[PDB]
Amino acid sequence: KKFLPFQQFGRDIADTTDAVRDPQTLEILDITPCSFGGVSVITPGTNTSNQVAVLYQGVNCTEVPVAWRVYSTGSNVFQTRAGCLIGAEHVNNSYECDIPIGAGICASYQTSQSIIAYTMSLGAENSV
C-alpha cells in the first residue's frame, strides 16, 4: 500500500487497524490475524468402539503441527477441501455415504477395524 507522506494508519470496515507505519524506519507493514477454526470429532457409536478421528476446519494441515497432541503424530494425515483430517486412512473405492464430512467426502468405520474416508457414490451405472 502506498501511504502518502501525511498518512499513518489504515482502517477496516469494523474499525480495526490493518496496516501501520513503523515509527522509526518509516515503512509500511500489513497486519493479519492468526488462524482459527472449529474442531469436529468423528465417531462411530460408543457401543461399537472407542476410537475417533478429528477434522480441523478450513485450516491447511501444516499449521496444526506448528501449534492433547497424541494424534497429530498421524502417519495418516490427509488434506480435504473441507480442512485437515487426522486419524483416518484414505481408500480408493467408492461406497454410499455413512457419515458426511463434506465437499463430496464421507467417512465410515470398517475393516483389524479402522476409520476410512472415501468419495461417496451416487449409484450403480446402467445403459438402456
Partner: protein, 429 residues
C-alpha cells in the same frame, strides 16, 4: 360471440417451450460468540459467563439451519438410484436434444444451457479452502462447503434426462423399459384427448417446431440479463445481512470507545467493568437479531424446496393433468437443468390455433330414435352433418359404430333430422 347453436373448433396447433426458475438452498454460515463479542480478552469472557447459555443456543440454531440445507438438495435431486446413460446413436425420430445433453469437452460435463445459467449469476462465498470476504471472516464468521459438489448435481440431472427420453414414465415406477421415441409421443397425445394418428401424419412439422422453440430459449437466455432475478435476490439478501452484522462492531452503545483494547489499556479493572458491560449488551443484542431473521428466511426457502420436489416428481417423471401446474397449455413433457442454488424446468406444451365456425346440435332423430355421439361432437359444414373429435377438426360420416341409441326423440331440446348410415346393409345391399 356466444349463441345457442354455434361452436368453434381448431384446425392447427403449436408446440411451446417455456422456463421456470425455483430456489432450492442457500449458503451455510457459522458464527462464534466468544470471538464476535469478546475477541481475545479474558476479562470480557469472565464477564460473559454471567449470562449462562445464550451462546450455546445461538450455535444450535445456526447448526440446525446448516443441516437443513443439505436435506433440501437431497430431496429435490435424488429421485433415481441408477445412473442411466444415453446410447451413442441419436436416432430420436427427428427431434434434436443437442443443447441439453451433456458435453464431454468441459472439465465439468455440463450442457450448453447450464453453462449459460452458471455465467449469468454472480455468486460469492464459495466456502472452499481459502474483498469483504476476509474482513468478515476475521471476526468469528465462517462459511461451510456443501455436501454435494457441483459436478454431482450435473450427473443426477443427466441421468434424469437419459431415463426420460429412452424409457418414458416407466423408470419412475420400476425398471426402465425402452420404447421408440415417436411412439412415446403418440402415447402422450392420447393423454390429452387427441387421436394418435395425428402425430404420425404430422411428424416432421412437430419436430421442426420443437427444435425452433429450443433455439429461441437459447438466444433469449444468451441475451437478456434479468431472467434469473429470483436467485440473485437470495444471494443479495444473505450478503447484505452479513455485512450489517459486521458493521455493528463500530458502535459505542454509550461507552467511551468501540475498541476493547483501548478500554483495557487505560482504565483499572473496577471501572473498566462498567464500560465492558455496556459493550457486551449491545453486541449480544445484535447477534440475536441476526439469528432470528435467518430462521425466518430458512423457513421460506424450505417451502420453495418442497414445491420444487413436487414438480420434479409430477411433471418430469410422469404426465400431469392439473391445470397450469406445469405451464400454460396442455402438458406434454418437461426437462430439468441445474442453476447455482436452484433448478430450472423447461416445459413442453400443446396449444391449438386456426379456429373456425360451425353450427351444432345435441342429437339426431332418425326413425323415432335418438342417436348420441360415442366420443366427439356433431357439426354442420353448411349443408351436411359430420362427427368430429373435440380438439382437432377431422370430419367423418355418421354411422351406427360411432353413435349410440337411447330413447325416442320427443324430449331433447334442439334435436335435428338427418340420416344415419348403417355399415352392414351396404354389404347386404
Amino acid at each position: 360471440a356466444y349463441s345457442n347453436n354455434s361452436i368453434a373448433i381448431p384446425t392447427n396447433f403449436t408446440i411451446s417451450v417455456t422456463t421456470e426458475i425455483l430456489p432450492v438452498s442457500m449458503t451455510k454460515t457459522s458464527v462464534d460468540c466468544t470471538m464476535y463479542i469478546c475477541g481475545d480478552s479474558t476479562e470480557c469472557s469472565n464477564l460473559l459467563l454471567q449470562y449462562g447459555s445464550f451462546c450455546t443456543q445461538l450455535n444450535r440454531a445456526l447448526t440446525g439451519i446448516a443441516v437443513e440445507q443439505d436435506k433440501n438438495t437431497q430431496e429435490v435431486f435424488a429421485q433415481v438410484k441408477q445412473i442411466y446413460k444415453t446410447p451413442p446413436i441419436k436416432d430420436f425420430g427427428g427431434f434434436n436434444f443437442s443443447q441439453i445433453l451433456p458435453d464431454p469437452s468441459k472439465p465439468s460435463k455440463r450442457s450448453f444451457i447450464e453453462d449459460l445459467l452458471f455465467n449469468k449469476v454472480t455468486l460469492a462465498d464459495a466456502g472452499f479452502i481459502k474483498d469483504l470476504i476476509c474482513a468478515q471472516k476475521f471476526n468469528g464468521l465462517t462459511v461451510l462447503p456443501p455436501l454435494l459438489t457441483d459436478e454431482m448435481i450435473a450427473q443426477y440431472t443427466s441421468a434424469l434426462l437419459a431415463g426420460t427420453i429412452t424409457s418414458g414414465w416407466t423408470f419412475g415406477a420400476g425398471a426402465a423399459l425402452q420404447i421408440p421415441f415417436a411412439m412415446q409421443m403418440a402415447y402422450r397425445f392420447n393423454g390429452i384427448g387427441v387421436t394418435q394418428n395425428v402425430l404420425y401424419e404430422n411428424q416432421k412439422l412437430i419436430a421442426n417446431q420443437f427444435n425452433s422453440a429450443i433455439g429461441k430459449i437459447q438466444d433469449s437466455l444468451s441475451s437478456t440479463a434479468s431472467a434469473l432475478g429470483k436467485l440473485q435476490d437470495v444471494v443479495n439478501q444473505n450478503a447484505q445481512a452479513l455485512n450489517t452484522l459486521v458493521k455493528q462492531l463500530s458502535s459505542n452503545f454509550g461507552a467511551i470507545s468501540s475498541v476493547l483494547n483501548d478500554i483495557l489499556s487505560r482504565l483499572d479493572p473496577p471501572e473498566a467493568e462498567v464500560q465492558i458491560d455496556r459493550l457486551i449488551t449491545g453486541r449480544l443484542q445484535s447477534l440475536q437479531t441476526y439469528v432470528t431473521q435467518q430462521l425466518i428466511r430458512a423457513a421460506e426457502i424450505r417451502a420453495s424446496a418442497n414445491l420444487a420436489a413436487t414438480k420434479m416428481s409430477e411433471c418430469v417423471l410422469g404426465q400431469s393433468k392439473r391445470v397450469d401446474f406445469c405451464g400454460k397449455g396442455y402438458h406434454l413433457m418437461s426437462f430439468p437443468q441445474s442453476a447455482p442454488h436452484g433448478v430450472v424446468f423447461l416445459h413442453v406444451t400443446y396449444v391449438p390455433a386456426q379456429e373456425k365456425n360451425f353450427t351444432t346440435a345435441p342429437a339426431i332423430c332418425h326413425d323415432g330414435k335418438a342417436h348420441f355421439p360415442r366420443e366427439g361432437v356433431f357439426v354442420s359444414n353448411g349443408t351436411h352433418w359430420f362427427v368430429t373429435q373435440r380438439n382437432f377438426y377431422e370430419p367423418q360420416i355418421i354411422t351406427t359404430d360411432n353413435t349410440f341409441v337411447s330413447g325416442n326423440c320427443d324430449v331433447v331440446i334442439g334435436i335435428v333430422n338427418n340420416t344415419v348410415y348403417d355399415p352392414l346393409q351396404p354389404e347386404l345391399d
